[PDB]
Amino acid sequence: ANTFLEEVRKGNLERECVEETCSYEEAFEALESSTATDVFWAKYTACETARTPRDKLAACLEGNCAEGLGTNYRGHVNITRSGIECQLWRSRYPHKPEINSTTHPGADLQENFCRNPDSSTTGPWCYTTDPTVRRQECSIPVCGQDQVTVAMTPRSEGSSVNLSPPLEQCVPDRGQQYQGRLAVTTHGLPCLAWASAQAKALSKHQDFNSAVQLVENFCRNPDGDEEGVWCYVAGKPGDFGYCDLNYCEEAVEEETGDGLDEDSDRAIEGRTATSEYQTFFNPRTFGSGEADCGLRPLFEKKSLEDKTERELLESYIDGRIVEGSDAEIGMSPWQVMLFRKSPQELLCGASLISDRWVLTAAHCLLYPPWDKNFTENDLLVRIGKHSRTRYERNIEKISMLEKIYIHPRYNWRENLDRDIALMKLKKPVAFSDYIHPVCLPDRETAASLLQAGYKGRVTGWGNLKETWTANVGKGQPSVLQVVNLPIVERPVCKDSTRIRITDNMFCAGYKPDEGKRGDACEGDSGGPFVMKSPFNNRWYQMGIVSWGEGCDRDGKYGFYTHVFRLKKWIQKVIDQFGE
Ligand SMILES: [Ca+2]
Ligand SMILES: [Ca+2]
Ligand SMILES: [Ca+2]
Ligand SMILES: [Ca+2]
Ligand SMILES: [Ca+2]
Ligand SMILES: [Ca+2]
């Protein structure tokens, strides 16, 4: 600024806007690169306390130290003060940040690098990937001293020395041989005495195993329910609650068939060997037409094959990843679109299991950290939709939710285990070409289909990508979209994530090679993952399209929540409504 005849000499960004109080004009004049201009401005601003001396401003230009509350820090530290992983600022997992990339673009928000966007009192902080705590301060160095902004005490997990190691063996056979005296539930609801009047009244119609004795008030699983030990709890009639037992990891794919000869070449299609559908659920409360699951009148009733079926066999051409393809008309009858009642907003996807029950992701209904706590009267569903933004009155239908059941084993605190939610419609919707329930595979059926090497199908409109990712550049498809994804190895699935994965969740999809990210984040969250069974010409839905690392992290596949074992559990719901 001073030395007036400076404006005729050539200049030095450091001999004008560093060793001297300068105009942003001379700054603008000397910079022009308006992105770095904003950067230098941000510098100046943050360096408002680093104006003097000169080397202090040089260090503030280096940016490795956070100035004051941490507005200027531009390093590479992306870890909380206690070692918790920093959540992506732009992404909504696991919390939707009111203060994020859109609100603070000038801070150079990196992948997860610790920042102080709002100049928070905790200094440079970061949102945490752990759903339990939304935010945590980062231990970022402050300028002027070799001092960090907050105490760095990394989280050491439970040790193998200071606690007592349980010698209790893992429970096999899903608890068909366990009779322990554990008497505490996961959610704390007390177990009603099995010999009491209410339990006897509720179980008189239930054929509990005679070998597994029914003790007074402990957790018992004699009904052959694969989920685990459950007990009746106080409250409304028929209330049930499941207890936590550390079952041995009983992968469905590892069931060895005792009738499969080792001649595995040229897989034989079903000819004169028709596998009939076995009704595991009573039509009275599970709904009529159960025998007609997944049978489209346009395709199944006339033996018309879709143009996308020729890719079912995993022996296809060198397993190259196939891009997204638009689905046909009427080929997605079991898809449901979970919509916000008020105001207008698309929420999630869901699977149609019966004409009067619907299956949807639990996180779409309940997520207190997400400011999301929906009652039965605040969301609706739409079945048989072709285009999201349009309304085709005749062929599509809408429904309003009445009753919601949440499985007590749904664990959103560690890994979103068992993302299960059940819904009931007050006004039933009859059968149609574009609306038809999908079949429910059992344990043996799932094992047979998975060991047959058939690809899975995921249908949706891209709402999963909108909800769990901030990737702008591929607009949300308003057209029905379908993606084919095969299965991968389970131990590799464990090695593909830094977070623990339960047996109820499995990997599916091609391996995204370096240089591109896979399409595992296509479709809608909570939607179906279906495979056309070659043994009965039917479509079996392996589970729910739940949140996976395929959205938030590149190089990952789709993680899906298994619901095939829940057959015994399913009736346990409608046994409450048998009146
Ligand atoms: Ca000057
Ligand atoms: Ca000047
Ligand atoms: Ca001078
Ligand atoms: Ca000038
Ligand atoms: Ca100048
Ligand atoms: Ca100089």
Side-chain angles (χ1 to χ4, degrees), residues 1-5 8-13 15 17-18 21-24 27-28 30-31 33-579:
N2 293 334
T3 66
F4 158 78
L5 236 173
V8 125
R9 14 161 147 271
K10 292 182 292 297
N12 224 315
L13 196 37
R15 193 232 47 212
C17 291
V18 171
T21 296
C22 103
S23 83
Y24 68 94
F28 257 106
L31 229 161
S33 179
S34 60
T35 302
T37 301
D38 308 332
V39 166
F40 180 43
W41 179 217
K43 244 89 102 291
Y44 247 135
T45 69
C47 317
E48 187 93 15
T49 53
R51 300 293 165 83
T52 47
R54 187 203 139 279
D55 283 327
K56 190 173 185 178
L57 183 50
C60 197
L61 292 175
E62 165 175 77
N64 286 336
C65 67
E67 180 74 297
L69 303 183
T71 64
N72 64 328
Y73 171 73
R74 302 296 174 266
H76 291 353
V77 177
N78 50 13
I79 312 173
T80 63
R81 68 163 217 83
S82 56
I84 296 189
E85 173 185 351
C86 284
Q87 137 185 17
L88 309 175
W89 301 81
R90 48 199 171 277
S91 179
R92 303 168 188 166
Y93 166 79
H95 313 273
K96 195 180 199 173
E98 326 169 12
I99 296 168
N100 58 93
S101 302
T102 307
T103 59
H104 287 103
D108 186 72
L109 296 197
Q110 307 287 82
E111 295 277 56
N112 53 337
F113 290 1
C114 289
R115 297 293 176 274
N116 196 9
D118 46 356
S119 301
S120 180
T121 61
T122 67
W125 53 292
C126 78
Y127 304 94
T128 59
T129 50
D130 198 14
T132 61
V133 187
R134 184 183 187 93
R135 47 142 63 174
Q136 183 180 175
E137 56 249 8
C138 296
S139 184
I140 292 299
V142 222
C143 306
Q145 286 176 359
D146 200 340
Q147 171 202 161
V148 289
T149 41
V150 78
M152 212 294 178
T153 56
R155 272 193 178 183
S156 62
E157 301 181 13
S159 61
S160 61
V161 184
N162 300 122
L163 301 178
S164 303
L167 294 178
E168 174 183 3
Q169 303 180 349
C170 63
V171 191
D173 294 2
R174 304 309 299 185
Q176 288 191 359
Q177 293 300 331
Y178 171 80
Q179 290 193 31
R181 299 185 64 92
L182 190 60
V184 287
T185 58
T186 60
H187 295 269
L189 291 184
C191 289
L192 231 179
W194 292 88
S196 60
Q198 306 186 20
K200 284 190 174 182
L202 293 179
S203 299
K204 186 180 180 180
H205 280 246
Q206 309 300 333
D207 189 7
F208 283 154
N209 203 337
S210 60
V212 182
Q213 295 297 330
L214 296 177
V215 206
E216 34 176 345
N217 51 12
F218 301 148
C219 305
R220 288 300 170 263
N221 190 37
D223 61 328
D225 200 326
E226 325 290 343
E227 190 81 318
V229 286
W230 62 269
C231 75
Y232 306 102
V233 296
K236 298 180 180 180
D239 288 335
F240 58 90
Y242 285 70
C243 317
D244 176 67
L245 278 185
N246 184 20
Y247 293 107
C248 329
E249 295 193 8
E250 195 188 37
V252 57
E253 307 86 13
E254 295 200 355
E255 269 194 330
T256 65
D258 298 3
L260 307 175
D261 295 326
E262 292 189 345
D263 302 327
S264 58
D265 289 317
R266 286 185 174 179
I268 306 178
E269 302 179 0
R271 181 203 173 188
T272 68
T274 64
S275 181
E276 295 180 358
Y277 193 83
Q278 187 70 19
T279 61
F280 208 83
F281 318 99
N282 222 16
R284 289 189 176 186
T285 48
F286 190 75
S288 296
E290 177 176 336
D292 282 357
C293 58
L295 303 185
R296 305 166 300 196
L298 300 179
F299 288 75
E300 253 68 290
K301 284 189 179 301
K302 297 124 184 175
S303 294
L304 286 177
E305 297 191 358
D306 55 81
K307 307 165 188 174
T308 63
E309 190 185 6
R310 298 147 184 170
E311 310 183 29
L312 278 185
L313 290 185
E314 285 190 358
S315 60
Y316 211 58
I317 41 180
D318 232 323
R320 298 202 309 182
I321 305 180
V322 182
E323 308 175 7
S325 63
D326 306 324
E328 294 176 328
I329 172 175
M331 71 177 306
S332 185
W334 46 78
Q335 167 70 30
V336 185
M337 235 173 173
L338 179 68
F339 270 87
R340 197 181 192 177
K341 273 190 174 185
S342 183
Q344 189 180 17
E345 168 189 345
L346 171 62
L347 290 181
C348 279
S351 60
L352 182 65
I353 54 183
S354 65
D355 69 329
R356 52 188 62 179
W357 293 95
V358 194
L359 176 63
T360 184
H363 69 258
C364 301
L365 303 179
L366 173 63
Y367 209 168
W370 228 85
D371 291 331
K372 182 194 304 178
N373 191 9
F374 277 97
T375 59
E376 293 80 349
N377 313 325
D378 298 328
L379 338 90
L380 57 92
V381 286
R382 313 192 75 169
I383 324 180
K385 288 198 57 54
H386 182 278
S387 185
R388 181 189 68 95
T389 59
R390 296 196 59 174
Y391 178 79
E392 296 180 355
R393 166 190 175 185
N394 300 331
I395 68 173
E396 74 184 13
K397 288 294 185 176
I398 319 176
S399 302
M400 306 229 306
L401 314 172
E402 182 184 4
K403 176 58 186 179
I404 290 180
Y405 273 92
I406 295 297
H407 199 297
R409 290 302 204 96
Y410 164 65
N411 176 26
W412 57 268
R413 311 175 185 91
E414 310 183 29
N415 48 13
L416 268 179
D417 186 13
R418 288 145 176 159
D419 192 3
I420 316 168
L422 190 60
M423 303 180 305
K424 190 176 188 61
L425 306 179
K426 184 177 179 179
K427 296 182 181 180
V429 44
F431 301 145
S432 62
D433 307 4
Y434 313 90
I435 297 178
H436 208 49
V438 68
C439 306
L440 308 186
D442 62 77
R443 178 176 168 183
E444 170 184 342
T445 304
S448 178
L449 291 180
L450 288 182
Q451 293 198 7
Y454 275 69
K455 295 185 181 178
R457 164 181 300 180
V458 177
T459 59
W461 279 260
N463 184 78
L464 160 74
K465 184 165 301 181
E466 183 193 26
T467 293
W468 290 117
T469 52
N471 289 328
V472 183
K474 305 177 180 183
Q476 181 187 202
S478 55
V479 194
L480 165 65
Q481 292 296 330
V482 53
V483 47
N484 260 331
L485 292 183
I487 321 295
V488 216
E489 299 178 358
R490 178 175 173 92
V492 183
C493 186
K494 290 187 178 180
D495 302 1
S496 62
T497 166
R498 311 194 311 182
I499 310 177
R500 190 170 188 175
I501 289 302
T502 57
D503 68 330
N504 197 265
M505 296 187 305
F506 70 103
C507 283
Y510 310 91
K511 171 186 178 181
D513 320 325
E514 294 188 12
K516 275 188 177 182
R517 173 174 44 89
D519 21 317
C521 199
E522 297 283 55
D524 296 356
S525 177
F529 174 72
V530 299
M531 303 164 50
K532 186 178 179 182
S533 180
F535 309 94
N536 51 17
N537 196 28
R538 287 181 171 270
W539 309 79
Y540 286 69
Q541 180 198 340
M542 299 296 303
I544 308 175
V545 183
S546 181
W547 163 83
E549 289 192 342
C551 284
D552 306 347
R553 288 184 175 180
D554 307 7
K556 308 298 178 176
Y557 0 97
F559 286 76
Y560 300 82
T561 290
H562 260 332
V563 302
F564 69 106
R565 304 172 182 175
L566 310 181
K567 278 190 174 182
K568 302 290 188 183
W569 168 75
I570 288 179
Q571 212 80 4
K572 286 261 300 302
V573 180
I574 58 187
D575 287 327
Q576 304 191 15
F577 292 154
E579 291 182 354

